[PDB]
Structure formats: structure tokens, C-alpha cells
Design a protein around this ligand. Structure first.
Ligand SMILES: NCc1ccc2ccccc2c1-c1ccc(C(=O)NCCN2CCOCC2)cc1
Ligand SMILES: N[C@@H](CCC(=O)N[C@@H](CS)C(=O)NCC(=O)O)C(=O)O
Ligand SMILES: N[C@@H](CCC(=O)N[C@@H](CS)C(=O)NCC(=O)O)C(=O)O
Ligand SMILES: [Mg+2]
Lengths: 200, 199
């Protein structure tokens, strides 16, 4: 049975975006609940682990953005065709998440924030882009012969990095091509044109 | 069975979850611990310059939890429903997110010590509370039987207890869960035979 899905997150792409891409690709109806800082204290206090996004499935609350994303892609063409391919997909996803999680997003000190950010973007990001390009190895998609949610996450994470470092992929045309390929998937393209425009 | 070769530092660290799984499933594997000497060298071979990696018949896999999930698919350590599987993944990422916050590599000693103390005295207790409430009076974290999330809880808490021995004083149920994991025969045997390291 098709459940009632309610996604709760801040008004931004951020960590909720991978879930939104999956819902769009699979044409799944859901409530895109974007809260305001004002209502967060209250909502926060009722969550088992106090972090968002969370996805309520028929009232049962699920947490952890990638755990949710994997759950929604189970038994779909986005998971990876084989058990091994699923491992490769899960691996690329965590490699991207690991990096994104290195940034101190809370930081209020514009300068010292822009220093931890500056180091990561200037000194570490290019190394990761190289390894991702090497991994793709001239192939059309990151894993196997068709799109997986690892490709969705690559496009999502790179879009965020590009906001702060526009020259991120100047030495990786093949990574730019993969981004465009993901962005061209009809359901994804439709979501990209319609989603609320936010900075992150 | 496939020829498995696990590569990681001589420590429990991020490879331990894989090691527990192999033990519990009675799957033979080469437990390869590298030399801090050949580290800057062997690094240039890894897919993303990170360990652990798991070689399976000439094919390389990386990312500890991706590998752990792969090894537990279709086994009794996996969740029993698609939903339980999501709960397993979420608890594991919540634990990993926290352990990943520690500056294990920080060379600046005063900075490293400030951050460790901050995480252990301020953030850690909140997580212990949330985990204890999540477990409630149930037997295991997810469902009615042990899953690899219980393994990960025991692994991560063992390391946190090294730095903060009184971490679970107000959480007897979490202590009980640790002991239940440690009491599983195959796991107990591994804990008894593994290299004794701080981390
Ligand atoms: N048992 C440790 C443990 C447990 C659970 C985890 C979960 C997620 C991520 C990491 C972990 C980990 C975990 C993994 C690796 C390291 C590590 O590489 N530290 C090296 C410290 N050296 C000290 C001397 O100076 C040079 C550096 C520390 C903790
Ligand atoms: N790895 C987790 C991280 C969850 C997370 O840290 N979320 C942040 C928002 S991006 C949060 O809820 N922090 C705000 C708070 O702790 O009050 C996930 O991907 O879901
Ligand atoms: N999330 C990853 C992290 C892998 C990781 O960062 N491993 C560390 C060792 S604990 C590493 O290879 N770093 C050494 C380096 O970057 O030179 C995993 O669980 O496998
Ligand atoms: Mg993670």
C-alpha cells in the first residue's frame, strides 16, 4: 500500500534534497514540509534524535537522510541492480556525505568559518573530485549501466559545493557531463525547475 | 565462499564492524593490518585514499558501513522488514555521525583535547539519553533480535568508554545491551582473540 509521506526539513535543499529527488523520480506524492526557525524548538523536542530531516511514514517517524533515501529506493531501479552494485552505490554515497559533513555548517564567525570552508574547498575538494572522476572511469554513470541514487547525490552535493567554489569542476568535464545527464532525467528536470529556489 | 581480504590499521576503529560480522557469520577472511610505515605509500592505491577496503575475489570495495550492510544482506543480522532495515541504517548513521565528529587526526594537542572533552561531556550524554529512550525496555535496538546496529552500538561505546568511563552510569539498559552483544558466542570469541589496541 502507498503510504502517506510527510517530509520535514528547513526551507533549503540541504540534506532533504536527496529524498525529494527520489520522490520526484518515482512519482511519489508527499508533503514537503518546510519549517521556520520559529517552530523548530517545538518540533526538535519531539524527535527521537532531535535532528532533521525526518520522514513520517503513515505517522511513524524515520530519521537520517541517507537511511531514508535507501529505504525509498529499495526494490527500485535506483538502488543498484546487484547486491554488489548496491554496495558500490552505498559507498559512493557515504564518500560524498563524509566530505559534505566535514564542513562546519553551524559556524557564525564569517571569517573563521570561511577559513575552515576555504581550506576544505581549496585543498581537499579537488582531490575528491579527481578520485570521483577516476572512479567514474569514462563510464556513463557512477555505478553500473544506468542511473542510481548515487548519481542523484553526486549532482546534489556538487551543486552545493559549486555555490562556494564555481571552479570546482573546471578540470573535470566528465563530471560536468554527469551532472547535466542527471539534470536531464525528465522527472529530475521537472523537480529542478519547480522546487523552491534557496541558496543551499 | 569468496576470498575476502580486509585492509585497515592495527586498531578496531572503522573496520571492527566488518570484523564482528565476519565472526558472527563464521566467514573466513584475511585480517590485514598495515604498517604505519607503508601508510603514505599504500595510500595511493585505495579508491578514495581511505581504509578500510575489502577485497573480494579481485574486486575492491570501500566504506565500512557500505561493506557491513553488504555482508549482512540476506542474513539474520539484517532488519527483518524493509522498515526495520531503515531503522538499522539510521541508528548506525547516528552513531557514525557522532564518532566522526572527533578530531582523531588533530595534531594540535590542546585543540584536540578541548574538542574531545567538549564532545564527551556535552554532546555524548545527550546521545546516550536518546539511544536509551529509543531502546526502551526492548531486547535489542531494532526488532526482536540482534542486528548489526547492536554490534555498532557495542563497538562505538567501547571506544567512548575509553575516554569517558562514567558515560553509561545513568544508562543501565545500554550497559546491558553491550553485555548482550559481548555474550554472543562468536562475538565473545572474537573479542577474546583480537589484537588488544587502545582504539
Ligand atoms: N575504536 C575507535 C573508533 C570507534 C568507532 C568509530 C566510528 C566511526 C569513526 C571512527 C571510529 C573509531 C576511530 C577510528 C580511527 C581512529 C584514528 O585513526 N585515530 C588515530 C589517532 N592517533 C593518535 C596518535 O596520534 C596520531 C593519531 C580513531 C577512532
Ligand atoms: N547525518 C544526518 C544529520 C542530521 C543533521 O545533523 N541535521 C541537522 C540539520 S542539516 C540538524 O537537525 N541540526 C539542527 C539541530 O541539531 O538543532 C542526516 O543526514 O540526516
Ligand atoms: N566513512 C569512512 C571513512 C574512512 C576513513 O576516513 N578512514 C581513515 C582511517 S580511520 C583514512 O583512511 N584516512 C587516512 C587518510 O586520509 O590518509 C569509512 O567508514 O570507511
Ligand atoms: Mg555517514
Amino acid at each position: 500500500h502507498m503510504p502517506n509521506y510527510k517530509l520535514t526539513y528547513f526551507n533549503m535543499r540541504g540534506r532533504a534534497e536527496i529524498i525529494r529527488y527520489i520522490f520526484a523520480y518515482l512519482d511519489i506524492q508527499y508533503e514537503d514540509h518546510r519549517i521556520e526557525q520559529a517552530d523548530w524548538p517545538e518540533i526538535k523536542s519531539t524527535l527521537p534524535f532531535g535532528k532533521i530531516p525526518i520522514l513520517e511514514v503513515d505517522g511513524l517517524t524515520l530519521h537520517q537522510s541517507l537511511a531514508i533515501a535507501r529505504y525509498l529506493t529499495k526494490n527500485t531501479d535506483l538502488a543498484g541492480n546487484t547486491e554488489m552494485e548496491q554496495c558500490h552505490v552505498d559507498a559512493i554515497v557515504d564518500t560524498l556525505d563524509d566530505f559534505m559533513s566535514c564542513f562546519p555548517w553551524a559556524e557564525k564567525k564569517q571569517d573563521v568559518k570561511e577559513q575552515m570552508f576555504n581550506e576544505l574547498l581549496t585543498y581537499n575538494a579537488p582531490h575528491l573530485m579527481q578520485d570521483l572522476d577516476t572512479y567514474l572511469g569514462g563510464r556513463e554513470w557512477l555505478i553500473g549501466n544506468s542511473v542510481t541514487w548515487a548519481d542523484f547525490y553526486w549532482e546534489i552535493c556538487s551543486t552545493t559545493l559549486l555555490v562556494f567554489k564555481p571552479d570546482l569542476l573546471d578540470n573535470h568535464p566528465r563530471l560536468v557531463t554527469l551532472r547535466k545527464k542527471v539534470q536531464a532525467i525528465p522527472a529530475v528536470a521537472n523537480w529542478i525547475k519547480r522546487r523552491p529556489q534557496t541558496k543551499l
